[model samples]
Target: GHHHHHHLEDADAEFDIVIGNIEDIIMEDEFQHLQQSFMEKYYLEFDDSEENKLSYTPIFNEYIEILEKHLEQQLVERIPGFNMDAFTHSLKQHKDEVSGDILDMLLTFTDFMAFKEMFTDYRAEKEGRG
Candidate 1:
């Protein structure tokens, strides 16, 4: 049990790469489709206004919805060993904590995630190999 481990062992079994390629396609392709929805709503929301460049509170919701659908597709079709639920829970958690208070949470989370990675790398650089 301890010795046997960790392998796909066949080109045919390399579903991981194949799946990753599919995910990339979906990310790019699906995002375009989703962005169109955003564009349509954005113009309509501002078209009625005299400014023609307004983005109200629902603007944040609009982008959030786009990401949600994109992630949902990825989560559903993800490859082996994927933890997409945890990924989604993190995003949904991000929204749940900030809903109705700020539309900046998405950008703020982006910053925080990058900072977190930086901190982790710095810590690992300073730590022993163990």
Candidate 2:
């Protein structure tokens, strides 16, 4: 029984780092442009108005909830072994520990290098020869 392994081998080529780099650049540029436009339009500074501040909180919270739900439903669900309850609990804990301001700062520079290492480790583990 001589099954053709060529197709499988061809498909298993190493990841296209060039394409990944291009995609990252595109995403970063787009985000930066959008953020600049938004800041220019809205201006990040807040006035000392209790009513305005109070209104902002609910609107921000609603947007956060919607984004979180969308991520859980789409991106998180696509990942294997994802646990919504655990993820939600851990996210809440993370926010509580660092608060959103610091968390956002950390996330801004965080890339998928750690994630790539994790995936490599997982692959090695599955091969039972790491």
Candidate 3:
């Protein structure tokens, strides 16, 4: 008698590669430089260090598009069927496990740091500090 076993090794390996490459894009120099530019540009418009009125200005949108396209191009090279929507779906599927890492990456951007800092009150309340 022979017993055959089925395992999702291929699926797991693919998911790991996809996720790791996506994370790599975030940590890559080009994307990091883009965020630094956004941070510098944003600070120029707001001189006060304590000021935190985060709005999606047109310039911010422009930077976002550039970052997205740059990321997309690299992802396409690394992944056969990569698309933003499908990538987002993958993130959603692993949200419970990856949410902290996602937030950690977002916090790396000084612009996002500012944006996130603005919500401290809410976070404080949620965490029972308020």
TM-score of 2: 0.25
Worst 10 residues of 1 by lDDT: 79-88
- Could you arrange the candidates by lDDT from highest to lowest? 3, 1, 2
In the order shown, the candidates' Cα RMSDs to the true structure are: 18.5, 17.9, 21.6
Instruction: Report the Cα lDDT for residue 9, model 2.
Output: 17
Q: Which is superior by TM-score, 2 or 3? A: 2
Better of 1 and 2 by lDDT: 1
* Model 2 spans with C-alpha error above 4 angstroms: 1-52, 80-130
lDDT: the better of candidates 1 and 3 = 3
Q: Estimate each model's TM-score.
A: 0.25, 0.25, 0.22
TM-score of 1: 0.25
> What tens-digit string does per-residue lDDT give for candidate 3 at 26-117?
32323323344444456456542322134434433444345456545543332221111123223223222322244445534433234223
Off by over 4 Å in 1: 1-54, 82-85, 91-130
lDDT of 2 by residue, 1-130 (tens): 2221111112211212212222232223233233333333453263211222455556535543564575446433323221111222222222123322343355435332343236434423422322
Error (Å) of candidate 2 at residue 87 is 11
Candidate 1 backbone clash number = 0
What is the C-alpha local distance difference test score of each model?
Answer: 0.33, 0.31, 0.34
What is the Å distance of residue 98 in model 3 from its true position? 15
CA displacement after TM-score superposition, residue 72 of candidate 2 (Å): 1.5
